[PDB]
């Protein structure tokens, strides 16, 4: 309903009001979101004269509403979900062995653009510390955001480690903890467990001499697989000997889809074994197993199994399983070993 | 950089094709639009001839790469879009295992403000039997990854993949490509350096078209060149109280304008900072865990990282990586110290 509005490229303007350690400022930012390519691009300004802190301090305060949710987790996007009236946005975000932020956000659409107003309170820092003794690399890491479902609050909480760079080698953590609530009384989705992959990078204006931040930003969803493979089994053997690989299958049933197995050995192309039609009254196997392996699969249980007798050294790889519901999807494999 | 910009927007595409397969004549006539920004690709495709001789899976790969999605640091290595708007010849042989030969030359130019793929197929030595003419190919298609080298004598590249058909008894028919693309125009173009393209596609079909038809969605992303990429060396199995020297090969930066620093993940724990060093080198930093038994260093010149691992204990197994930030975070593929007995 209100992903319609990020469809487009979206103007956006950042407003904060800062105070750390009595130390106070203000930064102002404008810019444009494209959630179409989960892209931001924006120019933050202190109007206050000189920044009391690091610019990358203020990174995550200063609208993952603009994150690229791809097709399939589109469900599970509380963010556009709750616009335009918006959400409310708290995080508390401590640096360790140094002080920490509070913070409290409002992201709503105004007219055409999307306002992000923050009030925020840093408190117990250090002044020789790395945040306020400005030891911190002018830069941004790439850093995965945890996100879980709040019922009891309708919204969202969020869980994430950002690192910071420090100039002598070393790195300042801030752990941040993060609770979303709608600003309406419109229904929201509320997701399942899932992280968005947010990579950012810093630089400045060349023309401007004022205190301020240029920063360009990629966040995009992830964490949810509509299929999955569990390969199990593999083991090292005797020649001669037998064994079986069970897979497990999620996110279709196995007996409306024909199933393969591959496996690849160390140096060689990742070759085609065995398989089994959709309905199950044909199975195929190539050539160099022919007779000694058996593939088989149980509706019930869902799993899918491929049985190895008479193995020879040159069956020795690992055996992946193999399904294609409008997509291919592959295990993470299984390794089996025949020596001597 | 010309040629870029013609892809900038989502632009319409019109195929055509031509083909004999063993003396069995049809043509495929298809319409949709790609975008490039996102590689993907949406058409519908239609047999005028009446029904397809062929399964329609095997005329995927044969029926617009320009419109793969290069990333900014792959931009140079582009040759698809380079070409454009005069555009290039796309030659394959296709060898279905067992089984007959494709042979196809295309032309794909920009018409107006449609992007055209014109294309003639020949088939020959085909089992009328076989998994082809007799269309024992399931209604699907694979993941393949598309590789991608230079030929410096066209003008142009080189391509060799193996597509994988499902066959409906539970088997796959093997199509092996060999691919060779060339400008149509003498103006100077992109070439690559070796790189892949990582591409998805999904069948479906139209409810109200009674034709023969298909319904075909693809994603189509290069990849395998970074623009910047440390590689860890070194580790080994070591015992308690042992020492061993970790190296990492830099490429895409100097080692001495940047600060460079080593992770390191226990099984099953979160991975940790351990060592690093500024960026002028005059100021390096460990952990309290590794304090005074590891020290980290570099060599300006071979541009390479080091970290000297002394009085091991078995708590320092783990995989290493190594890290810098150019404009974004990069990590190595890491490599595995163990410390145990023997």
């Known amino acids: 309903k209100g992903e319609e509005l990020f469809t487009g490229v979206v103007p956006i303007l950042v407003e904060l009001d800062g105070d750390v350690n009595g130390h106070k400022f203000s930064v102002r930012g404008e810019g444009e979101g494209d959630a179409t390519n989960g892209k931001l691009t924006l120019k933050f300004i202190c109007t206050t004269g000189k920044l009391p802190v690091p610019w990358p301090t203020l990174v995550t305060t200063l609208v993952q509403c603009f994150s690229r949710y791809p097709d399939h987790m589109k469900r599970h996007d509380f963010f556009k979900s709750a616009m335009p009236e918006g959400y409310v946005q708290e995080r508390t975000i401590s640096f360790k062995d140094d002080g920490t932020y509070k913070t409290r956000a409002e992201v709503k659409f105004e007219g055409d653009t999307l306002v992000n107003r923050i009030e925020l309170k840093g408190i117990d820092f250090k002044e020789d510390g790395n945040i306020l003794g400005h030891k911190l690399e002018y830069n941004f890491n790439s850093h995965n955001v945890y996100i879980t479902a709040d019922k009891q609050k309708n919204g969202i909480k969020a869980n994430f480690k950002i690192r910071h760079n420090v100039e002598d080698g070393s790195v300042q953590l801030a752990d941040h903890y993060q609770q979303n609530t709608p600003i309406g009384d419109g229904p929201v989705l509320l997701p399942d467990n899932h992280y968005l992959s947010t990579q950012s990078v810093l630089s400045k204006d060349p023309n401007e001499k004022r205190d301020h931040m240029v920063l360009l930003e990629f966040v995009t969803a992830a964490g949810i697989a509509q299929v999955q493979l569990v390969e199990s089994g593999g083991a090292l053997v005797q020649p001669g000997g037998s064994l079986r690989l069970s897979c497990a299958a999620s996110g279709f049933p196995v007996n409306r889809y024909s199933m393969r197995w591959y496996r690849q050995a160390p140096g060689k192309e990742r070759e085609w074994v065995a398989g089994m039609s959709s309905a199950g009254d044909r199975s195929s196997y190539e050539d160099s197993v022919k007779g000694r392996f058996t593939i088989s699969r149980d509706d019930a249980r869902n799993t899918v199994y491929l049985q190895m007798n008479s193995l020879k050294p040159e069956d020795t790889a690992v055996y992946y399983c193999?399904?294609?519901?409008?997509?291919?999807?592959w295990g993470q494999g299984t390794q089996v070993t025949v020596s001597h | 950089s010309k040629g870029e910009e013609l892809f900038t927007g989502v632009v319409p595409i019109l195929v055509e094709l031509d083909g004999d397969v063993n003396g069995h004549k049809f043509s495929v006539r298809g319409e949709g639009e790609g975008d490039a920004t996102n590689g993907k690709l949406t058409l519908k495709f239609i047999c005028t001839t009446g029904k397809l001789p062929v399964p329609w899976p095997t005329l995927v790969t044969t029926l617009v790469q320009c419109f793969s999605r290069y990333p900014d640091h792959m931009k140079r290595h582009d040759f698809f879009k380079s070409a454009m708007p005069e555009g290039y010849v796309q030659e394959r042989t296709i060898s279905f295992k067992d089984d007959g030969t494709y042979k196809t030359r295309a032309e794909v130019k920009f018409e107006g403000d449609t992007l055209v793929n014109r294309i003639e197929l020949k088939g020959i030595d085909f089992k009328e039997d076989g998994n082809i003419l007799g269309h024992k190919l399931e209604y699907n298609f694979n993941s393949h990854n598309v590789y991608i080298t230079a030929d410096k004598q066209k003008n142009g590249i080189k391509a060799n993949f193996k597509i994988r058909h499902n066959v409906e008894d539970g088997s796959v028919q093997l199509a092996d490509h060999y691919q060779q693309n060339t400008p149509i125009g003498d103006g100077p173009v992109l070439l690559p350096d070796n790189h892949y393209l990582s591409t998805q596609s999904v069948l479906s079909k139209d409810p109200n078209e009674k034709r023969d038809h298909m319904v075909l969605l693809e994603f189509v992303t290069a990849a395998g060149i970074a623009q910047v990429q440390l590689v860890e060396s070194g580790g080994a199995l070591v015992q308690p109280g042992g020492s061993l020297r970790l190296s990492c090969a830099a490429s895409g930066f100097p080692v001495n304008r940047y600060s460079m620093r080593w992770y390191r993940q226990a099984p099953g724990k979160e991975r940790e900072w351990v060592a690093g060093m500024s960026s002028a080198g005059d100021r390096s930093s460990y952990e309290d865990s590794v304090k005074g038994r590891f020290t980290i260093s570099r060599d300006d010149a071979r541009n390479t990282v080091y970290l000297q691992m002394n009085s091991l204990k078995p708590e320092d197994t783990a995989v290493?990586?190594?890290?810098?930030?150019?404009?974004?975070?990069?990590?190595?593929?890491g490599t595995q110290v163990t410390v145990s007995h023997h």
């Open positions: 193999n399904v294609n519901v409008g997509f291919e999807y």
